[PDB]
Write a protein that holds these residues in place. Structure first.
Motif, PDB file in Angstrom:
ATOM      1  N   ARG A  40       0.835  -1.182   0.000  1.00  0.00           N
ATOM      2  CA  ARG A  40       0.000   0.000   0.000  1.00  0.00           C
ATOM      3  C   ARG A  40       0.875   1.239   0.000  1.00  0.00           C
ATOM      4  NH1 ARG A  40      -0.781   1.628   5.503  1.00  0.00           N
ATOM      5  NH2 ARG A  40      -0.132  -0.007   6.973  1.00  0.00           N
ATOM      6  N   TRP A  41       0.325   2.343  -0.485  1.00  0.00           N
ATOM      7  CA  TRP A  41       1.078   3.571  -0.616  1.00  0.00           C
ATOM      8  C   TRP A  41       0.526   4.705   0.236  1.00  0.00           C
ATOM      9  CZ3 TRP A  41       5.742   4.283  -3.202  1.00  0.00           C
ATOM     10  CH2 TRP A  41       6.185   3.199  -3.969  1.00  0.00           C
ATOM     11  N   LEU A  42       1.447   5.509   0.742  1.00  0.00           N
ATOM     12  CA  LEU A  42       1.123   6.601   1.614  1.00  0.00           C
ATOM     13  C   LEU A  42       1.643   7.869   0.965  1.00  0.00           C
ATOM     14  CD1 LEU A  42       0.315   4.419   3.577  1.00  0.00           C
ATOM     15  CD2 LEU A  42       2.047   5.218   5.226  1.00  0.00           C
ATOM     16  N   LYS A  43       0.937   8.973   1.178  1.00  0.00           N
ATOM     17  CA  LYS A  43       1.446  10.278   0.800  1.00  0.00           C
ATOM     18  C   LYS A  43       1.528  11.063   2.082  1.00  0.00           C
ATOM     19  CE  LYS A  43       0.630  14.384  -2.080  1.00  0.00           C
ATOM     20  NZ  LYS A  43      -0.260  15.069  -3.054  1.00  0.00           N
ATOM     21  N   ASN A  44       2.722  11.579   2.387  1.00  0.00           N
ATOM     22  CA  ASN A  44       2.984  12.239   3.667  1.00  0.00           C
ATOM     23  C   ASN A  44       2.398  11.475   4.848  1.00  0.00           C
ATOM     24  OD1 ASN A  44       4.226  14.437   2.256  1.00  0.00           O
ATOM     25  ND2 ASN A  44       2.180  15.275   1.877  1.00  0.00           N
ATOM     26  N   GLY A  45       2.565  10.163   4.842  1.00  0.00           N
ATOM     27  CA  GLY A  45       2.154   9.339   5.966  1.00  0.00           C
ATOM     28  C   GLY A  45       0.684   8.943   6.008  1.00  0.00           C
ATOM     29  N   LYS A  46      -0.113   9.464   5.078  1.00  0.00           N
ATOM     30  CA  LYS A  46      -1.541   9.183   5.074  1.00  0.00           C
ATOM     31  C   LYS A  46      -1.932   8.310   3.886  1.00  0.00           C
ATOM     32  N   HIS A  52      -7.225  11.781  -4.332  1.00  0.00           N
ATOM     33  CA  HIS A  52      -6.285  12.758  -3.776  1.00  0.00           C
ATOM     34  C   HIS A  52      -5.526  13.568  -4.829  1.00  0.00           C
ATOM     35  CE1 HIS A  52      -6.072  10.483   0.318  1.00  0.00           C
ATOM     36  NE2 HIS A  52      -7.016  11.408   0.328  1.00  0.00           N
ATOM     37  N   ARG A  53      -5.628  13.175  -6.098  1.00  0.00           N
ATOM     38  CA  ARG A  53      -5.060  13.969  -7.190  1.00  0.00           C
ATOM     39  C   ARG A  53      -5.896  13.735  -8.432  1.00  0.00           C
ATOM     40  NH1 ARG A  53      -1.553  11.581 -11.135  1.00  0.00           N
ATOM     41  NH2 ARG A  53      -0.341  13.533 -11.279  1.00  0.00           N
ATOM     42  N   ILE A  54      -6.026  14.774  -9.247  1.00  0.00           N
ATOM     43  CA  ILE A  54      -6.909  14.746 -10.404  1.00  0.00           C
ATOM     44  C   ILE A  54      -6.714  13.528 -11.313  1.00  0.00           C
ATOM     45  CG2 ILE A  54      -7.395  15.887 -12.617  1.00  0.00           C
ATOM     46  CD1 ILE A  54      -7.167  18.567 -10.809  1.00  0.00           C
ATOM     47  N   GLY A  55      -5.470  13.196 -11.640  1.00  0.00           N
ATOM     48  CA  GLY A  55      -5.244  12.072 -12.533  1.00  0.00           C
ATOM     49  C   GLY A  55      -5.348  10.695 -11.887  1.00  0.00           C
ATOM     50  N   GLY A  56      -5.636  10.645 -10.579  1.00  0.00           N
ATOM     51  CA  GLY A  56      -5.562   9.405  -9.818  1.00  0.00           C
ATOM     52  C   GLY A  56      -4.168   8.797  -9.946  1.00  0.00           C
ATOM     53  N   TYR A  57      -4.061   7.483  -9.769  1.00  0.00           N
ATOM     54  CA  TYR A  57      -2.773   6.805  -9.902  1.00  0.00           C
ATOM     55  C   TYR A  57      -2.964   5.331 -10.226  1.00  0.00           C
ATOM     56  CZ  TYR A  57      -3.682   5.097  -5.126  1.00  0.00           C
ATOM     57  OH  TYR A  57      -4.240   4.483  -4.028  1.00  0.00           O
ATOM     58  N   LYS A  58      -1.920   4.710 -10.753  1.00  0.00           N
ATOM     59  CA  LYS A  58      -1.969   3.295 -11.078  1.00  0.00           C
ATOM     60  C   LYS A  58      -0.991   2.516 -10.206  1.00  0.00           C
ATOM     61  N   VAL A  59      -1.435   1.368  -9.715  1.00  0.00           N
ATOM     62  CA  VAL A  59      -0.552   0.439  -9.027  1.00  0.00           C
ATOM     63  C   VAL A  59      -0.449  -0.883  -9.800  1.00  0.00           C
ATOM     64  CG1 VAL A  59      -0.256  -0.912  -6.935  1.00  0.00           C
ATOM     65  CG2 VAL A  59      -0.893   1.492  -6.796  1.00  0.00           C
ATOM     66  N   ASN A  78       6.066  13.380   0.285  1.00  0.00           N
ATOM     67  CA  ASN A  78       6.663  12.080   0.558  1.00  0.00           C
ATOM     68  C   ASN A  78       5.774  10.907   0.122  1.00  0.00           C
ATOM     69  OD1 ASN A  78       8.972  13.239   1.846  1.00  0.00           O
ATOM     70  ND2 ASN A  78       7.717  13.540   3.703  1.00  0.00           N
ATOM     71  N   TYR A  79       6.361   9.944  -0.586  1.00  0.00           N
ATOM     72  CA  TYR A  79       5.635   8.740  -0.985  1.00  0.00           C
ATOM     73  C   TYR A  79       6.248   7.489  -0.384  1.00  0.00           C
ATOM     74  CZ  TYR A  79       3.142  11.782  -4.122  1.00  0.00           C
ATOM     75  OH  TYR A  79       2.390  12.803  -4.629  1.00  0.00           O
ATOM     76  N   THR A  80       5.466   6.805   0.447  1.00  0.00           N
ATOM     77  CA  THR A  80       5.955   5.660   1.220  1.00  0.00           C
ATOM     78  C   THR A  80       5.192   4.400   0.834  1.00  0.00           C
ATOM     79  OG1 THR A  80       6.371   7.126   3.125  1.00  0.00           O
ATOM     80  CG2 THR A  80       6.305   4.743   3.567  1.00  0.00           C
ATOM     81  N   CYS A  81       5.902   3.394   0.338  1.00  0.00           N
ATOM     82  CA  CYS A  81       5.310   2.067   0.146  1.00  0.00           C
ATOM     83  C   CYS A  81       5.390   1.330   1.489  1.00  0.00           C
ATOM     84  CB  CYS A  81       6.097   1.282  -0.914  1.00  0.00           C
ATOM     85  SG  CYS A  81       7.863   1.044  -0.427  1.00  0.00           S
ATOM     86  N   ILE A  90       7.509  -3.718   6.420  1.00  0.00           N
ATOM     87  CA  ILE A  90       8.637  -2.845   6.122  1.00  0.00           C
ATOM     88  C   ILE A  90       8.197  -1.714   5.204  1.00  0.00           C
ATOM     89  CG2 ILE A  90      10.354  -4.682   6.428  1.00  0.00           C
ATOM     90  CD1 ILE A  90      10.500  -4.941   3.408  1.00  0.00           C
ATOM     91  N   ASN A  91       8.936  -0.611   5.244  1.00  0.00           N
ATOM     92  CA  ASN A  91       8.602   0.554   4.458  1.00  0.00           C
ATOM     93  C   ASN A  91       9.813   1.304   3.926  1.00  0.00           C
ATOM     94  OD1 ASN A  91       9.121   3.017   6.380  1.00  0.00           O
ATOM     95  ND2 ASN A  91       7.976   1.556   7.635  1.00  0.00           N
ATOM     96  N   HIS A  92       9.553   2.155   2.938  1.00  0.00           N
ATOM     97  CA  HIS A  92      10.580   2.916   2.260  1.00  0.00           C
ATOM     98  C   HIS A  92       9.924   4.177   1.727  1.00  0.00           C
ATOM     99  CE1 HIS A  92      14.148   3.758  -0.135  1.00  0.00           C
ATOM    100  NE2 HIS A  92      13.340   4.039  -1.141  1.00  0.00           N
ATOM    101  N   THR A  93      10.641   5.300   1.772  1.00  0.00           N
ATOM    102  CA  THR A  93      10.052   6.580   1.393  1.00  0.00           C
ATOM    103  C   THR A  93      10.819   7.331   0.299  1.00  0.00           C
ATOM    104  OG1 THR A  93       8.967   6.890   3.553  1.00  0.00           O
ATOM    105  CG2 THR A  93       9.345   8.884   2.201  1.00  0.00           C
TER     106      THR A  93
END
Length: 99
Positions: A40-46, A52-59, A78-81, A90-93
């Motif tokens: 899962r992905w976080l933006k600034n910890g959330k 959350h952004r006009i174009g959305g996103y792909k995973v 910040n983008y954190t998986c 585990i996580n990485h930013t």
């Protein structure tokens, strides 16, 4: 059998990304583990939601990747998986700067 772990850290080594607006951005966190970990992905910890952004996103789970098209200054942050299974988390930013 085992906790999540990073398969390829070389792809993850560069943490700070400065990209020109309108470009496509891809962040990846290639992982292994058994059972197969979720991502899962976080933006600034959330929790980072489509709205959350006009174009959305792909995973793409097979590539452990997050993709944002036509980036805009609002995308800075910040983008954190977060990769997890029964035996660990585990996580990485990354940090994204749009210019």
């Amino acid at each position: 059998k085992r906790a999540p772990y990073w398969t390829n850290t070389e792809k993850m080594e560069k943490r700070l990304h400065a990209v020109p607006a309108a470009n496509t951005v891809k962040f990846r966190c290639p992982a292994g583990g058994n059972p197969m970990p979720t991502m899962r992905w976080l933006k600034n910890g959330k929790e980072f939601k489509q709205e959350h952004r006009i174009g959305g996103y792909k995973v793409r789970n097979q590539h452990w990747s997050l993709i944002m098209e036509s980036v805009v200054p609002s995308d800075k942050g910040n983008y954190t998986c977060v990769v997890e299974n029964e035996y660990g988390s585990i996580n990485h930013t990354y940090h994204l700067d749009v210019v």
